[PDB]
C-alpha cells in the first residue's frame, strides 16, 4: 500500500509539503523492508 502511494506520487516535485511527504514515505518503506528482512532471516522465533 505504501509503495502504491509512492508510485501514485507526481513526477515533478518542488513543494516543501511534497518533499516532506516523499521523504516520510521513503523512510516508512525502508523501515518496513528492514522489519520484513529481520523476520525472514530465520524460521523459528523466540521473543523476550
Amino acid at each position: 500500500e505504501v509503495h502504491k502511494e509512492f508510485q501514485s506520487l507526481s513526477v515533478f516535485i518542488d513543494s516543501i509539503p511534497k518533499k516532506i511527504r516523499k521523504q516520510r514515505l521513503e523512510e516508512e518503506m525502508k523501515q518496513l523492508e528492514h522489519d520484513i528482512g529481520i523476520i525472514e532471516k530465520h524460521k523459528i522465533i523466540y521473543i523476550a
Partner: peptide, 6 residues
C-alpha cells in the same frame, strides 16, 4: 540459528 526479539 535462533532469532531473538525484545
Amino acid at each position: 540459528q535462533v532469532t531473538i526479539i525484545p
